[PDB]
Design an enzyme around this catalytic site. Structure first.
Site: not given
Ligand SMILES: [Fe+3]
Ligand SMILES: [Fe+3]
Ligand SMILES: [Cl-]
Ligand SMILES: [Fe+3]
Lengths: 515, 392, 132, 168, 392, 140, 137
Positions: A103, A133, A136, A198, A232, A235
């Site tokens: 992360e 991130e 996370h 991801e 996610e 992402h």
């Molecule tokens: Fe990510």
């Molecule tokens: Fe992440």
């Protein structure tokens, strides 16, 4: 005028601001990425999840309040923090802290995507991802923080950011979802971080794992990890937009298939054995065979829904897939041999498979009993668990010709004489230094790009030193200063100390001296 | 039914819970329950902020402060390290020392901005229902605010993007967090300016909230020529990540940015009957002070006073300040031409008022930044340099 | 519709040597294009209501290929072509403010191309920007 | 044979004592350049200090950087390398050098040597980073041309390895 | 080894969880899972607001809308019922019909106010760090704002306490919630006025934030004589709970209160360089519009248009409005004397400016309330009645 | 003046406002309770838990977020709502709804205490209590 | 020294007829003055840390009559005279903002006279406003 005005109640919703973001950029000669890249195609794309700063915060804060309510109120009142099978609570020391570094590197990779994006909407989208991130990183930290406070063994939950440096499995973590993202082509992060990392590997790593946590009594990790992955979808969508731009320009598209294969191999090389080992050997109750988890998420669903669909537009099935599927079946069993044999270098307490575990391994991986099972049972008979035994299996491997090597590229350990996964040893001398490579894909990477791959391995740093000295120097002890963090069993009695390790007289060799 | 096992939970399933209870020891295996207990606390007790943030970055011992060892596993083509000392001219005995005085990890940061997000929409719904826009000066609203406050959003947007390479290049966790939160606050400022313009458009027939005129002004109006040149340099002209943060927040935004947002648009709003804009500048000015606390800690507490490299670092910080203060003074000299277009208000838009505004900005800056790094500055000379651009 | 979308479809039914023989078969060493999408929903009061009263009623009526499986902490959903959830329909069911942004609080993963449009969240097999 | 402890050992201590005797920018520049040619990259002359060279390089960098700030005019910190050269000229010279490279093996050695000779504090950071990025772009592109075109047997020969062992 | 049993949890203890699992049926015993499904939804589907609020009050069938039966279990000495029709002159076919359009039950109410609470303190810490108080007109700050804005807190405080008997006497749950949330918002307004004064005291040497001078002005200054007389009557002079809410929010606060808060202190803050006060009036004006939505629903949608008693209720609403509008016009006539003490600003504090402000207040009020109950009002006549108190 | 000011970061804490609440009352003849009572004694008392409106909301919202997180997230994911012995799930039909009417009546009783209080500090405290009893009605 | 403050102290130890005989004894048909206080704390991450590291360490050291009992969802605390908890001490322990107002988020009930003063929460047997102070200082 001064008297008349529409007094209907109105605000401004996020999408009303978002439609003007593209116009926030302006043209000047130096307005271009600072990072090196092979990808120079047009990339004026549209965000699929419209967000502005205020709405980003509102969404994530709402996620947080529910997550921290469950953790600090409900589950604490239930005492859930100590209702976890010891094997799984030990596993989460490693899964959560290792993911934490992934992360953390994802922040940096996402900043490279931010820097290399050419559309204001995409720069906006990648800042949101950069922030996620960070979120996370702190969520992974919070899991180990919570375990430190409520689980029966806080050691190693409470200090992995230094104790991880002792052992060899950490080295490969610094590449898988880390250096492999941030030390390379910035636009290519759309392929390695996003299209592969991801879109493929976070699902088994962050989602599928929550069911193993629940099976083993851990409702902390599901509460957090399931919230991690909600971010996610933004992402993956960011990455897909840039992948489309790459595929649409023939000059950029000619790099895509080689970048995809290198990303897939680089990530699966470590992810496949290490997480499978942690799932199956770091659990009491197993959800399903790891190879089935991998088949579902990696081969069939990611492989078919992303890569197979993109085959219509020239994206090729990774040429390394066959080698990877062999790894999905056997490599985590190979890795378990190394993990159990070198247990003193970790920060978690391990459990040899019990009789029902062994029957399950053999039923689902026929041939396991006669190879891996016999070895584990012999180690048990020799005193694997007993601090007074003077027995550590790494020395036993060497005494029977089962040398352990470290891949110069991936840092994944390799025992050629016992491995059933993909691999074969190549040892080269270049400019007075010997190097060990273990597969066709990494060997190419090193041969073409030697200056990218100069990672010192544990044998080079620890050469000729005795094990307990290395562990003590690295703070691999509990608060009493002498009992190891790591253990070869999960019971509360007969814990091993530095003196127990020293009695074995284990000294690090140079595995390439024989060549 | 379903094709896959309905997994039984170890927390609630009797058989699995009994097996777990038998496996769990009757006593704890260590007493140290403080997550990352070995962090050196900045304050009287270790904070949750520090516990969750500090040493997340896996630096080796050859990057000052790192606890790991050995080379990176994979480096750039050519050999650039994943993180490295080549990323900045500044040096320190420990890159981990920085602490945000607001102690923001991700959660408190979004919690606070969430409050502002939702309260903003309630305020707008009531402000529109109140009809309070009826008393705003129309010339201010249409010719100054819509056009030149709108154009200011491009300065905030550029400062936002100046952080992209910082987020990749900087060398510790607390620094990375500080930088990314500063970046979101800057893009928020730009989005909030556009939000205000879109809101006025719903209340005032004929009011155009397109960015066309703001963008034309930012890119071609002399009033913003110097500002845009500086922002372009800070964002895209350099990659030393300490230079970007210092030039961007501690020099440019602390002089030109503070003058424009606070001394011009916020202050004059409360002279021209504008009851709307202060709600928006309240946010940008709160964000500025929070960002300043963290920027101050990085450059003053840590780098300008590092036991081994403080004087070394001040040599570079002084050279950067000389350069970017000149750029910011030029930006302000261009900007005060805007006063030629506003209605005269004694003590606010006449020479004395503008002079006192520049004295506040340069005087505050000398106290807040220049004195702390040893940068000598003659405030009156800087005021006088900018007033050369003021039309009497 | 709908056995091919089960979590344990096909090879996942096999164990031991039979599983190994198909896993390592020559034809299964390259990926195979799939028209499916996978949606993962984190279990919560709101999500469980959406599962029972939207996904498994109007959703399944529109797309009978939908499969929902219980994975303890989350719902696993697989379907041909696309899955959609209208947050306005969810808001009516829940009796509280519920924008598409609020819907995403417990949408945990996507295998497919996902996006929001208006009040609707969609995950599709379509490759936008490449497909026509 | 037997390594000393990781973070505190006689090799690092010995090199620190050498570094402390540097007294001028010219001397420290030749010192750090000689050090980087001898002990860094796959083309280094010696691996005798392999597990300590990165820390030692940091310490040399620190000494040179402080000598620069104590001894040099500010303008030189911005526009010159500590070799005396114009920084922008160094940039142009090495970008042209690598764009004229006829093979990935020529291009890789140009990039590696640029870093050995001009890594900060020798070159100003801003000039160095943009030169390093321009060089890396060229190196990546030439290496990712027919990446899989040469069999491993051929790559081993092109690289010039002595093959010590091939399993199977 | 505590003296009492450590109780085993049925959720996690194996044997108790197994016993419970055996006792729980394998199927649900009804399919109706909508809490209080029989509530008549005001909107397209039942809201959680309605589910949690509606029919909490246990009224019998002899209080219009009640679902219960029989007399109360215990009544006051003499026979006054626990709740009763004698509590108000107004009549309805169902006292439960009211719905707050903001749909506030307790949780969304404190969630929103918590946001404002925390952001206010962040704003103040940054505003003091900004030094922005330096440009406020000192005469406004010290002689008008501190003294007469301070005095206005007593109007808000009295309106707060007018709700005490309403909270006891009113006849349904959604009405009680509206009334109590309105009351807290009024005491919040009073407290926020004092918070602003206490904050300025920390910034301005010699600035006195005690309430002595504000209280003297409220209780004895002619400028507030009419206002105080009205608040005293609405709070303590009547007990009809509908009369209190209507006179307080729909007449007095909607005319005098809106003029004081919005047309005087908020508007003029943005003529005299006051960058602080608009942050505080932003909150009171948001609260006013939220309260108005609920008051509008109670008195217009429900009572003035009740199918059986609408005209009946308008007879009382019209009489109350005639009385309390006269009280409010007198209060405004007194209050506009304050303009004699302020620095003249064309279009804001001259006769034309004050007239346009009164036209907004009376004009907006006619649309928002008078027209909806059939109350005839000549706006120009009310403006002129107040302007008789304006000096010039 | 226009240039010089203390720029130390300050706010205003709840107790700093609270100390001025007693002064918010003013004297007039009709300033007395509307309700019948036998108790006519002096009752100028001070609150033991200083609170103002903003801090009241902050506190109760913080309690709520943790409570509703536990209910809507964690316990629902555990299926806890149907892990109750039937006897007890039936008992909570009456305990919670009967308590609800007690909380609801407590709103009205607290309003009578608000009305009959003579100290501004106590009127402030009883409004907070009135608000709590609404909170409790909605919790039940 | 603290057995009398146990939840099952005294009559609560008895069962069956022995309990009934004391429960209905003539002398127990009127209340008996008690010098104790009871404090109930809702179980949570923060409270559980306060119990272990404040109440059961410094608290019990200052007031050894303190008894803490586990009641599933809450902690039951009983002591002679008074119980106090300093939110500033709790904040130091928790490493996050924690005013006396935050302390009360999980303070669930009180039998005694309770109040906040500065950063400290106190519940006392004292009858403030009725009991007279012991010293003039
Ligand atoms: Fe990510
Ligand atoms: Fe992440
Ligand atoms: Cl006082
Ligand atoms: Fe209650």
């Amino acid at each position: 005028d001064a008297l008349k005005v529409n007094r209907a109640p109105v605000g401004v919703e996020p999408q009303e601001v978002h439609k003007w973001l593209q116009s926030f950029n302006w043209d000047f000669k130096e307005n271009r990425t600072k990072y090196p890249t092979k990808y120079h195609m047009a990339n004026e794309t549209k965000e699929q999840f419209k967000v502005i700063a205020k709405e980003y915060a509102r969404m994530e804060a709402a996620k947080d309040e529910r997550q921290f309510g469950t953790l600090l109120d409900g589950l604490t009142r239930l005492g859930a923090g100590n209702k976890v099978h010891p094997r799984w609570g030990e596993t989460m020391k490693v899964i959560s802290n290792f993911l934490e570094v992934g992360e953390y590197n994802a922040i940096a990779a996402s900043a490279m995507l931010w820097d290399s994006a050419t559309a204001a909407e995409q720069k906006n989208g990648y800042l949101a991802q950069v922030l996620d991130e960070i979120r996370h990183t702190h969520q992974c930290a919070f899991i180990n923080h919570y375990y430190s406070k409520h689980y029966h063994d806080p050691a190693g939950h409470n200090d992995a950011r230094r104790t991880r440096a002792i052992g060899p499995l950490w080295k490969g973590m610094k590449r898988v979802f880390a250096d492999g993202f941030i030390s390379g082509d910035a636009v290519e992060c759309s392929v390695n971080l996003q299209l592969v990392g991801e879109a493929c590997f976070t699902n088994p790593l962050i989602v599928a794992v929550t069911e193993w946590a629940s099976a083993n009594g851990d409702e902390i990790t599901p509460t957090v990890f399931l919230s991690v992955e909600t971010d996610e979808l933004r992402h993956m969508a960011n990455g897909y937009q840039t992948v489309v731009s790459i595929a649409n320009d023939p000059a950029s598209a000619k790099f895509l298939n080689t970048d995809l294969n290198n990303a897939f191999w680089t990530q699966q090389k470590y992810f496949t054995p290490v997480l499978g080992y942690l799932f199956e050997y770091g659990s009491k109750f197993k959800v399903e065979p790891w190879v089935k988890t991998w088949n579902r998420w990696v081969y069939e669903d990611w492989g078919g829904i992303w890569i197979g669909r993109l085959g219509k537009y020239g994206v090729e099935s990774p040429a390394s897939l066959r080698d990877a599927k062999r790894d999905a079946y056997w490599a985590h069993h190979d890795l378990a041999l190394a993990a159990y044999a070198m247990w003193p270098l970790g920060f978690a307490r391990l459990a040899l498979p019990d009789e029902e575990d062994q029957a399950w391994f053999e039923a689902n991986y026929p041939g396991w009993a006669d190879h891996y099972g016999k070895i584990f049972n012999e180690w048990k008979k020799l005193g694997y668990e007993d601090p007074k035994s003077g027995f550590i299996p790494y020395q036993w491997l060497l005494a029977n010709g089962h040398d352990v090597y470290i891949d110069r590229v991936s840092q994944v350990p390799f025992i050629p004489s016992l491995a059933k996964g993909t691999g074969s040893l190549r040892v080269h001398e270049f400019n007075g230094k010997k190097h060990s490579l273990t597969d066709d894909w990494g060997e190419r990477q090193w041969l073409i790009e030697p200056e990218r791959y100069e990672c010192h391995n544990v044998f080079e740093q620890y050469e000729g030193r005795e094990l307990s000295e290395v562990i003590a120097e690295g703070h691999g002890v509990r608060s009493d200063g002498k009992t190891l963090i790591a253990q070869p069993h999960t019971r509360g009695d007969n814990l091993w100390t530095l003196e127990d390790i020293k009695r074995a007289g284990c000294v690090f060799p140079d595995p390439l001296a024989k060549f | 039914p379903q094709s896959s096992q309905v997994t039984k939970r170890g927390l609630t399933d009797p058989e699995r819970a009994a097996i777990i209870a038998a496996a769990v020891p009757d006593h704890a295996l260590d007493t140290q329950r403080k997550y990352h207990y070995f962090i050196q606390p900045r304050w009287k007790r270790l904070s949750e902020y520090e516990q969750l943030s500090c040493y997340a970055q896996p630096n080796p011992d050859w990057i000052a402060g790192g606890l790991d060892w050995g080379d990176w596993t994979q480096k750039f083509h050519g050999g650039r390290p994943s993180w490295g000392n080549e990323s900045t001219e500044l040096r320190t005995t420990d890159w981990y020392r920085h602490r945000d005085p607001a102690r923001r990890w991700h959660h408190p940061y979004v919690k606070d901005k969430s409050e502002e997000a939702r309260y903003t929409q309630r305020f707008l719904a009531a402000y529109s229902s109140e009809g309070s826009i009826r008393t705003i000066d129309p010339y201010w609203r249409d010719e100054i605010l819509n056009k030149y406050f709108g154009a200011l959003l491009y300065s905030e947007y550029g400062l936002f993007n100046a952080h992209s390479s910082v987020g990749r290049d900087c060398l510790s966790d607390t620094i990375r967090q500080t930088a990314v939160f500063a970046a979101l606050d800057k893009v928020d400022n730009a989005q909030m300016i556009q939000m205000e313009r879109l809101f006025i458009a719903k209340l005032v027939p004929g009011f155009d909230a397109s960015t066309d005129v703001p963008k034309k002004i930012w890119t071609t109006d002399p009033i913003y020529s110097g500002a845009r040149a500086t922002v372009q340099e800070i964002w895209q002209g350099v990659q030393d990540w300490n230079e970007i943060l210092w030039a961007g927040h501690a020099v440019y935004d602390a002089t030109f940015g503070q003058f424009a947002r606070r001394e011009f648009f916020q202050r004059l709003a409360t002279v021209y009957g504008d009851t709307l804009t202060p709600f928006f500048t309240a946010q940008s000015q709160t964000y500025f002070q929070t960002t300043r606390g963290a920027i101050d800690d990085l450059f003053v507490y840590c780098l300008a006073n590092d036991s081994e490299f403080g004087a070394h670092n001040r040599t570079f910080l002084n050279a950067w300040t000389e350069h970017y203060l000149a750029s910011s003074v030029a930006a302000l000299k261009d900007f005060v031409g805007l006063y030629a277009k506003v209605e005269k208000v004694a003590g606010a838009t006449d020479r004395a008022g503008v002079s006192e505004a520049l004295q506040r900005v340069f005087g505050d800056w000398k106290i807040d930044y220049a004195d702390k790094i040893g940068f000598r500055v003659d405030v009156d000379q800087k005021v006088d340099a900018v007033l050369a651009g003021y039309k009497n | 519709s709908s056995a091919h979308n089960a979590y344990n479809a096909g090879i996942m039914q096999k164990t031991g040597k039979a599983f190994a023989d198909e896993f390592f078969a020559e034809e299964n060493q390259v990926v195979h294009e799939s028209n499916a999408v996978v949606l993962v929903l984190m279990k919560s009061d709101e999500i469980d209501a959406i599962i029972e009263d939207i996904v498994l009623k109007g959703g399944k009526a529109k797309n009978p290929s939908i499969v929902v499986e219980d994975k303890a902490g989350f719902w696993w959903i697989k379907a041909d072509g696309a899955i959609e959830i209208d947050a306005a329909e969810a808001g009516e069911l829940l009796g509280k403010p519920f924008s598409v942004y609020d819907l995403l609080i417990n949408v945990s993963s996507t295998v497919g191309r996902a996006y929001t449009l208006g009040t609707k969240f969609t995950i599709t097999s379509e490759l936008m920007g490449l497909d026509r | 044979a037997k390594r000393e402890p990781i973070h505190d050992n006689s090799i690092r201590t010995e090199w620190e004592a050498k570094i402390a005797k540097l007294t001028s920018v010219d001397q420290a520049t030749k010192f750090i350049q000689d050090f980087r040619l001898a002990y860094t990259s796959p083309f280094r002359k010696s691996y005798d200090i392999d597990v300590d060279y990165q820390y030692i390089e940091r310490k040399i960098e620190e000494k040179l950087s402080v000598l620069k700030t104590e001894k040099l005019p500010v303008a030189d910190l911005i526009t010159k390398a500590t070799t005396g050269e114009d920084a922008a000229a160094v940039e142009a010279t090495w970008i042209a050098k690598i764009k004229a490279a006829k093979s990935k093996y020529e291009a890789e050695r140009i990039h590696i040597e640029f870093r050995q000779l001009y890594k900060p504090p020798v070159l100003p950071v801003n000039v160095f980073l943009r030169t390093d990025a321009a060089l890396g772009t060229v190196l990546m592109e030439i290496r990712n041309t027919d990446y899989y075109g040469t069999p491993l047997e051929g790559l081993r020969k092109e690289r010039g390895v002595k093959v010590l062992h091939l399993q199977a």
